[PDB]
Amino acid sequence: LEKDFLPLYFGWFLTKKSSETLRKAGQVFLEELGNHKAFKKELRHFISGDEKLELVSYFGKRPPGVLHCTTKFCDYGKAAGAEEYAQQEVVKRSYGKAFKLSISALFVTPKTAGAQVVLTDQELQLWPSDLDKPSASEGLPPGSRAHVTLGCAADVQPVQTGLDLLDILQQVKGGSQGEAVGELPRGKLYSLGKGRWMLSLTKKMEVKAIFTGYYG
Incomplete structure (x- = not known):
């Protein structure tokens, strides 16, 4: 018999609505930060490459869809402690349940x-x-x-x-x-x-x- 493999990772996956709300808040922050005098003055400590830096473009790799908060990265069982994490009663009992994160x-x-x-x-x-x-x-x-x-x-x-x-x-x-x-x-x-x-x-x-x- 072959064992069942574990997830790539466990975590909390935000709903569509919550992901949109957090995503937009993040984007607005990037715009405000990059416009801010205090940020512009320190650009040297931000990049080594010499105008204005648009942070939304700087952070060009973004989550495609819903956002998530990882608890344990498992790599299907290959990561240290993955099997031990997954076997916990609280993990099995909580699987598929809704939570509110702050x-x-x-x-x-x-x-x-x-x-x-x-x-x-x-x-x-x-x-x-x-x-x-x-x-x-x-x-x-x-x-x-x-x-x-x-x-x-x-x-x-x-x-x-x-x-x-x-x-x-x-x-x-x-x-x-x-x-x-x-x-x-x-x-x-x-x-x-x-x-x-x-x-x-x-x-x-x-x-x-x-x-x-x-x-994955």
Whole structure:
């Protein structure tokens, strides 16, 4: 007998409506950020190539359809900890169920653009706990990596978005976030240096999503 293979990854897949709402919010942020004096002044720390940079074009690789928030990347069972994650009762019980996710910030770096997701305690139960953990995650609470990718630079892989978020959270943890450098319609804009920018939403955006497995 042959084993059943696992998904490419598990995660929350936003509904059509929620994906459209978050996608549009992301795009508006890119337009506002790229128009902002504070951003234009730091373009050197953003790119090395010398007019105005249109961020919607810079982040040219974007999700084609619905947006998602990954919990555990499985690579069909090949990833470390994949089988252990999938066998959990809470994962099997939650499969196909609806959840509401909270978006607390949008961010941009020279590599990725994404949305920070803050999980409920119920949702944290579906967040993986692995042996090999990122070094950039140390000192940060479980689930800190949770995000929705909105765009990637040409030579960047989508997984980078979560690493970028962790890096930003590490900076904020150390209080290097600094004084807000702008006031956008949705929240305060922070310049974190090294081409990194964060919009802290005044009002968290709620999105509806289904927890399930993607197979590619």
